[PDB]
Amino acid sequence: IDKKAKKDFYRFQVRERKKQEI
Amino acid sequence: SAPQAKILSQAPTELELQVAQAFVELENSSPELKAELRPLQFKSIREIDVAGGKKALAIFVPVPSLAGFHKVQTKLTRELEKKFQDRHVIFLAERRILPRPRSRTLTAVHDKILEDLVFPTEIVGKRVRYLVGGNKIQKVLLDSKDVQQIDYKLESFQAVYNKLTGKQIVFEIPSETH
Amino acid sequence: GRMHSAGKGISSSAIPYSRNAPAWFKLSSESVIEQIVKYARKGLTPSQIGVLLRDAHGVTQARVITGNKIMRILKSNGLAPEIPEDLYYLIKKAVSVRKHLERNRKDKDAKFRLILIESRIHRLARYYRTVAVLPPNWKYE
Amino acid sequence: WSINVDDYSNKNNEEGLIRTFDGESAFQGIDSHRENSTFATGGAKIHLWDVNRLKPVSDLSWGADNITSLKFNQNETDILASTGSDNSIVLYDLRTNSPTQKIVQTMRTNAICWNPMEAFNFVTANEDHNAYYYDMRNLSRSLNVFKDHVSAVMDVDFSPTGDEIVTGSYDKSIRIYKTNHGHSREIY
């Protein structure tokens, strides 16, 4: 389940990545 | 609990009142089934004859409650049969058809009424034979989960389906010879 | 039946004729939904999540048990994917192929297998643009 | 209908339609009771008719399934057999005015003939390239099986001698079998 979990799939996930990007 | 509480309709029918006294009596007798029976409440009652000559109690119930009814419909239904013998107790949901209601919606609601009727048993299939003369024979194939009980009820299901949906059907149960 | 290949495989899943919930199923629909959001919150997809619920929770079909498709459940709770699942793994699939080619330039079949992939992406990307699920300005890479 | 015949010259007309019986559904089989004027028609429902009555006198039916063919008895003439599209053979008795028995078969049966010498015995023309010989009282099994056709058997008839049976099939042949032997002795 952990290996099959994706860090970037949902709307909120990339926005979290976008928050950390800047 | 008062019988009128069990009745959602503001003006309860005498038959509806009788089934309500029956239901609250089951609540009182039951030590813990009341916890499930008490929240359950039905919209109304319709008592419909059959070609067999008996009658069927169609209890109109809300769908979100109908789930809980289905949880408890076996025990409740046998008890209601005991209190009202020679009348077939069946629970059917009341679900909206108004947008004059649309024809596709009517086919849909008729078929849900069909699955709710066949409960506890489930529909195996639907068959339609087209006669050389042009007649159409519509048959519904049922599983053998509760074959005996529904075999004592097939005609009642048929009469209720004709009365509500205005369609002629025949319920058959594969895997045995009736 | 396969495009980009000569295979005629037919292996698939067989939805049961009955569309009602199984009789043995005795779990509240809401308790299913809270399981759906938790797995999606963890980062699992609509495809994997259905495997988990079906494998370990007895949920034969999210639509049958709950009355709604799982994407609609996730969307109703605010969980939606940036791009449709089919396209996203196609993009990652092409990325993995591309990353392979820089290190190994003599992988000439992988160069072909690449070509088959974005052609699939263009067809899938084109369709998603027509239905407006994908914004029109979107282009692959 | 009535037809003038030249068997006897004891008189000398009215040749043509005599009576018509209208039905709600299509008819697919007909036979007449030997002793009395009553005749049975097989439509969507098996109906018992009287000559002097335009409407069906009695309604026989086990269930909603149609009837494809029917044949009255010759010896115990009050008994009737019928064939259904649900791969079934139904027995009836007029003295009770109700059906008696069914057996559901694997394949459909197209025609029946009842043995004129044994009242309780009958043969059935079947769709599996076979013809089956039956005993009325114990129908759990067949008396004999006839298996020399290569296509579906369409019709079957007993000889008035009662010792021989002929079968018509879709394979362009007529086979005629001895009642106690399971293979055809001749092909036409």
Add this chain to the structure above:
Amino acid sequence: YEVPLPQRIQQRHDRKAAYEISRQEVSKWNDIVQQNRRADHLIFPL
């Protein structure tokens, strides 16, 4: 009395009773049938 059983269930029993009667009454023809089988020669008509 007892509550009436459904007509098909009632009629199924009626059919079964009818089939038993049909069997006994056709069985009356058994005696002549065995005679025909055992007969050395049959001259038609019988």
Add this chain to the structure above:
Amino acid sequence: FALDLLRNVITRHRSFLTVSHLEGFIPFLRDSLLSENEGVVISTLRILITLIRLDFSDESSEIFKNCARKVLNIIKVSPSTSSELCQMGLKFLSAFIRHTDSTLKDTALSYVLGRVLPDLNEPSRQGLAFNFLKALVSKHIMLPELYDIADTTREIMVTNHSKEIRDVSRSVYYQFLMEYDQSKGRLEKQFKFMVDNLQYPTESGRQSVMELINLIITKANPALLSKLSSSFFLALVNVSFNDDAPRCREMASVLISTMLPKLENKDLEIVEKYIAAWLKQVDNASFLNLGLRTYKVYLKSIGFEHTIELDELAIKRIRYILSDTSVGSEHQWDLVYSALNTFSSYMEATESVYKHGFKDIWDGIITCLLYPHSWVRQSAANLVHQLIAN
């Protein structure tokens, strides 16, 4: 148009509804009945049914005989009885036999009765099927089939749901048993049928028969009533004592209440014997429940002090039950509740309860005020309220 105008006129204007005025239309009515179009025939049936009550001459009466032949022929050609035009035909045939002295052939009536039998059970074609049948019993026509129909109309009573069929099938079978000649052994069989039908499983079925009892109880000969007194009483108390339906239990008590006063002095004596014996069974608590409850029915029907000995037995049982109401008591809450109820009826009947002799019972009643069971408290509260008032 002519038929519709004529029927409206005669109904609106009574004087035109006479033999002399409508004699001329008779040849048209007979022809209109045979007319091909279904609508004119239906109109012809209705007007003719309107005129059957009217007396007619010899020439003007032959139409109804001839009319009867065609409506019979009309029913034969009709595919199913559940038809608008066929219903009119059966309606006239019922109305024909009801009032017209002339009667149809036995064979024709037997055919109708056979066609009527399937519709007896179906509620939609119920009423018309019965109305024709009630005419047959009403005119006391003797037919072989009616005796069988008498049996069928009896099973359909106690074995059917519909309240309407109980109301209608109750009438015919009550008239049939009381009017048609029957053999004594069969009458006893009919009463043995009915007593078992008091033991019928369905609540409505037990409900149905008790009117058949009440009809016998309300209207019957003293000699017939005496013979069936013991059999009915034991059956009635049985259903009253133990039954799934409460409503059946009160109704059985009502029947006994209306029964016992009509009993003969000797027949009432067996009643006193049974109650006294049940009270005597101190060992069995269930018999005490039966004995006290029937004593309540015994009061308010014959009244108090009719038999002194039975009254003493009830009081001694009441004194016994109410005394041992402590924690160590083994008495069930049903028994103490039953004792209080009969005492309340005993209280209403006589004022002797206020004498010093009953003070022991009054102390027990005050003790039962705080009895653990709620029902016992309610009965005790009512008794004390009467004590405070008086």
Add this chain to the structure above:
Amino acid sequence: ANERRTRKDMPYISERKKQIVGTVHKY
């Protein structure tokens, strides 16, 4: 015949009874 070598419980089906599926009235 090949299957008969291993699987223990096979009822032999009479040629006179294979073609019957079922009978309403059992005897």
Add this chain to the structure above:
Amino acid sequence: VQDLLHPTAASEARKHKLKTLVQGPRSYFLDVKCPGCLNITTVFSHAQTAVTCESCSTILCTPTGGKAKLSEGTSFRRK
């Protein structure tokens, strides 16, 4: 020669899932009891994950190409 209207019962079971008169799944679920805590868990016959008892986090089954092989000692029933 066969009757597609009324195939024999054994015939469909032998036939491929999609080719029958009315196609349906040939799989099923199971009530598997955990050896450690004796609790009952629902598991798919062809379950594609190493289903773990929530109470004990103990492996109940392992995925395979076809049906998942139930772990040793794990009792089961058809549901």
Add this chain to the structure above:
Amino acid sequence: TRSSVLADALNAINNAEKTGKRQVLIRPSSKVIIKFLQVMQKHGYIGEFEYIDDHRSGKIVVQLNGRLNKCGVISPRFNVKIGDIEKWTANLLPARQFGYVILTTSAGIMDHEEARRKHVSGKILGFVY
């Protein structure tokens, strides 16, 4: 890829009557296939047939008595005027009155003689003889 389900049905029926089969299975089903089948049925070319619905496109089973000398679909579905109908009956039928040409008109899919009887017209589906 599927172009005409009705075409598939007619070809399957034709092959079934070629190889002597007393029954034929058709997939997928549709109202057009169904109404074509009652037309043939009412003219006696085919006998009993049954609809198996599986919550999906569906299946038809047709009994065949060997009387179908041909069934064909005219693709693409040309528009036909009332004056044009006889031309079609000349082109598709070996003889005048043997076998019938099927028109979908404003009143539905039926054969051609009914179409002249009700003075209706429309698009062409096929022929049967």
